[PDB]
Nucleic acid binder design. Structure first.
Ligand SMILES: [Mg+2]
Lengths: 43, 301, 73, 339, 73
RNA sequence: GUAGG
């Protein structure tokens, strides 16, 4: 801990942070109560 | 560009020419004319360049007529979206979805039917709106057949409330829907909505209701350190036993590695036979089960 | 001062306003000779409104029962 | 699929907006949210090169317009005289010729009215063509379509955050800094004060290595799932942070825009869709920074990322300078003298 | 209650052909005792009925029917 | 919400 540089985050930076991407509004299955695929809470 | 963008959308609709029977039937004639034009253009056979450009112009005019019908009937979708508003999806979003349904109906309409476009369209518009309401309204995504099951049982239960003037007993609901009470309770519990954490609970200082409830993933330091002391005492007690005995029991119960080894599985690295290792494992069971190396471990359970 | 009766009446009035808009919509989308007073009205807004006033409303408060005096007060 | 601009830098004080493009806040408000057009780039050198040719074409157009107008006037006069003569010869009633002549001259006046309206249309479109420049707003969409139709391949125009992104990509901030320094060296009044504020922001961009194009974000990050928990609740109920709903909204609207762009759709619907996407993104970063917020359940507004980091209940003043602590207690205090 | 019912005029469509009159409202004894309501977690309410009269000029007929709006706290 | 500080 020496300095907290802050600034504009370019699109390349956001892609770099991302380990993947999201494609659906799905959150969980109503029955299995488990995360869906390629959506929010996507494991 | 104003607040409440729906008002801006209605202004964007503006004043556009409503179509009388002759107008839209002629427009649809031009639509199918452009359709045939683009069909001819798409054919790999060589067409004269001027004829191809003429066909492209006819197709473009057809596209313009499509747009005219779209804009004229934008007013129709806005009314239909109002017909379904107030059910967890935003009004202009419903209007957009109804516009998609209109695009579908328009793409699937002609004057071959002896009726107005609007009567035919109302079906597609309601189709698209109900589909989106079933697929995107709830926080938890409910399948379409489940959506119709829940709303059917809900409306018929409301009808029972209006008729009997009393809360229908669950068996009555089950026979009405014809399914078992088990399905009734299943779908009923599946037919709820979440409560948001960021809600005022009591005073403003209490603030979000999120604070009140504890989690489960948190490692309780008490239990963790209890497990650590159990680990240390257990390792010491094993060390009390002979080296080979402790090793074989540890492999039988994975005290060094998360997966315990089966008896034969221990009889490869050590070079012992599966029954030899079984025998000495039993003797370790005998040696540990004495009252000697049991007082300490009894309190750890 | 809005005594209890006027408050409950105001909420019942809101509920009946919801009922009016609902039944008007139904009549706009209902055929003649198949309309009955039993069928056309939906009782949901009234029951929901009066319920929404007695739960989750500041003026509807938990009755303190420390003593008779705190009661009356 | 369709770029958007980030709410914070705009729709605020002029220090953060910085006047980075010399356009009033009304200009940006009416462009980003779909409503008025922009002239991103013009080949003004190309337009200036071919002025005599286009001027000659316009002159010939006016010449033929006047020729056909004179022909129409001649036809009008012949029609009027013919109907007058034939009805007065007929003599069906006392004064048929006067009535038909009145109708004919009314028709002539109406034809003159359309003549002058089309002349005005030509004049205004031509002078607007002569009024070309970058960063030019065109509120009237019909007028902009006329501009595209009458002349293309010379001016480039656009709508929404895409136009702004193109502008910033093409922007030359160094020349703006130079000319603003010149203005400050010799300037008076309010214009000078505005220039001073602008110099600050352009110099801040120039000294920083980062490009200004960050104004137009393209890929929206997402909060890690744990930080927005859909934690199970006893009783079959569920607990969700509003950020889940905001993300659902934005991803849904992006999906629908993809669906439209895939098929051939009109310009109105796609533009409305992009406006909707911009609205969703802005609500995500800031719910309530513009007009009514996304009330969600309707009882109260929906929380937003920026809303979380601010104020008494925000992150900073409630969970970094004051934290609950283990190993503590509380109780009434009474007086004991012998201590 | 009768006042709020009365101020609600009978609903009139664009044709003004039909009307619903809410003349008389009435109550019934509550089903649950106060002690029973407190013990068993029930909102102490009673039935509230109203006589709705359907009248259409086109039909030229009056159809009276009692309807139940809901349990009233 | 409402009491104490
Ligand atoms: Mg004190």
């Amino acid at each position: 801990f020496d300095e907290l540089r802050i600034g504009l985050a370019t699109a390349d930076d956001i892609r770099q942070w991302s380990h993947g991407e999201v494609k659906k509004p799905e959150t969980i299955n109503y029955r299995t109560l488990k995360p869906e695929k390629d959506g929010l809470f996507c494991e | 560009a104003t607040a409440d963008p729906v008002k801006d959308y209605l202004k964007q609709i503006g004043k556009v020419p409503l179509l009388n029977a002759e107008q839209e039937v002629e427009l649809a004639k031009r639509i199918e004319a452009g359709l045939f034009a683009e069909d001819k253009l798409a054919n790999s056979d060589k067409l004269a360049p001027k004829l191809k450009r003429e066909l492209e112009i006819i197709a473009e005019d057809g596209r313009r007529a499509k747009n005219h019908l779209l804009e004229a009937n934008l007013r129709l979708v806005v009314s239909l979206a109002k017909r379904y508003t107030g059910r967890g999806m935003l009004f202009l979003d419903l209007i957009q979805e109804g516009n998609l349904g209109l695009i579908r109906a328009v793409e699937k309409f002609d004057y071959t039917k002896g009726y107005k476009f609007s009567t035919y369209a109302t079906w597609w518009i309601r189709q698209a709106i109900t589909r989106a309401m079933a697929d995107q309204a709830r926080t938890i995504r409910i399948p379409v057949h489940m959506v119709e099951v829940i709303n059917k049982l809900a409306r018929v239960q409301r009808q029972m409330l209006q008729d009997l003037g009393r809360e229908p007993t669950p068996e009555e609901l089950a026979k009405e829907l014809d399914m078992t009470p088990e399905k009734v309770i299943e779908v009923q519990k599946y037919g709820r909505e979440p409560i948001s954490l960021h809600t005022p609970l009591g005073e403003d200082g209490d603030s979000e209701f999120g604070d009140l409830i504890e989690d489960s993933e948190a490692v309780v330091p008490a239990d963790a350190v209890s497990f650590t002391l159990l680990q240390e005492q257990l390792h010491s007690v094993l060390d009390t036993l002979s080296e080979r005995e402790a090793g074989v029991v540890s492999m039988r119960f994975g005290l060094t590695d998360g997966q315990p080894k089966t008896l034969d599985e221990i009889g490869k690295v050590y070079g012992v036979t599966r029954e030899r290792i079984r025998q000495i494992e039993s003797k370790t069971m005998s040696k540990l089960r004495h009252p000697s190396r049991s007082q300490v471990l009894r309190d750890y359970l | 001062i809005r005594n209890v009766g006027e408050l409950i009446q105001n909420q019942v009035r809101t509920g009946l306003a919801r009922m009016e808009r609902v039944v008007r919509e139904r009549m706009t989308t209902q055929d003649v000779e198949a309309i009955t007073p039993q069928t056309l009205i939906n009782i949901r807004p009234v029951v929901a409104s009066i319920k929404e006033f007695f739960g989750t409303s500041q003026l509807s408060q938990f009755m303190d029962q420390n003593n008779p005096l705190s009661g009356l007060t | 699929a369709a770029p958007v601009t980030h709410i914070w830098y705009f729709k605020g004080v002029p220090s953060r907006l910085g006047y980075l493009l010399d356009l009033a806040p009304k200009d940006l408000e009416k462009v980003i949210y779909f409503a008025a057009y922009m002239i991103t780039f013009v080949d003004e050198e190309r337009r200036t090169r071919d002025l005599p040719s286009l001027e000659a074409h316009v002159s010939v157009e006016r010449q033929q317009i006047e020729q056909r107008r004179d022909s129409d006037l001649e036809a009008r006069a012949k029609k009027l005289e013919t109907d007058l003569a034939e009805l007065e010869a007929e003599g069906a009633k006392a004064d048929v010729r006067r009535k038909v002549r009145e109708g004919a001259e009314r028709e002539m006046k109406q034809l003159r009215d359309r003549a002058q309206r089309e002349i005005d249309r030509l004049d205004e479109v031509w002078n607007r063509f002569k009024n070309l420049k970058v960063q030019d707003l065109e509120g009237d969409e019909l007028l902009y379509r006329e501009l595209r139709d009458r002349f293309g391949t010379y001016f480039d125009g656009s709508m929404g955050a895409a136009a702004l992104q193109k502008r910033l990509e093409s922007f030359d901030l160094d020349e703006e800094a130079e000319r603003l320094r010149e203005i400050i060296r010799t300037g008076k009044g309010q214009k000078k004060t505005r220039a001073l504020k602008r110099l600050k922001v352009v110099s801040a961009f120039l000294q920083t290595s980062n490009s200004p194009k960050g104004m137009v974000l393209d890929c929206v990050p997402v909060i890690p799932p744990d930080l927005r928990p859909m934690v199970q609740l006893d009783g079959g109920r569920f607990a969700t942070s509003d950020l889940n709903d905001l993300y659902r909204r934005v991803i849904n609207r992006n999906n629908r825009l993809k669906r439209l762009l895939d098929l051939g759709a009109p310009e109105i619907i796609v533009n409305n869709e992009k406006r909707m996407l911009q609205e969703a993104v802005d609500a995500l970063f800031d719910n309530g920074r513009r007009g009514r917020p996304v009330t969600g359940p309707g009882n109260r507004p929906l929380k937003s990322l920026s809303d979380m980091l601010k104020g008494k209940q925000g992150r900073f003043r409630q969970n970094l300078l004051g934290k609950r602590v283990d190993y503590s207690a509380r109780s009434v205090i009474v007086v004991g003298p012998q201590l | 209650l009768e006042e709020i019912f009365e101020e609600i005029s009978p609903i009139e469509d664009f044709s003004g052909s039909m009307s619903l009159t809410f003349r008389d409202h009435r109550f019934e004894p509550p089903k649950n005792s106060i002690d029973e309501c407190k013990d068993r977690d029930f909102t102490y309410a009673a039935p509230l009925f109203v006589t709705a009269e359907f009248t259409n000029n086109e039909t030229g007929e009056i159809k009276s029917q009692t309807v139940f709006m809901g349990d009233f706290p």
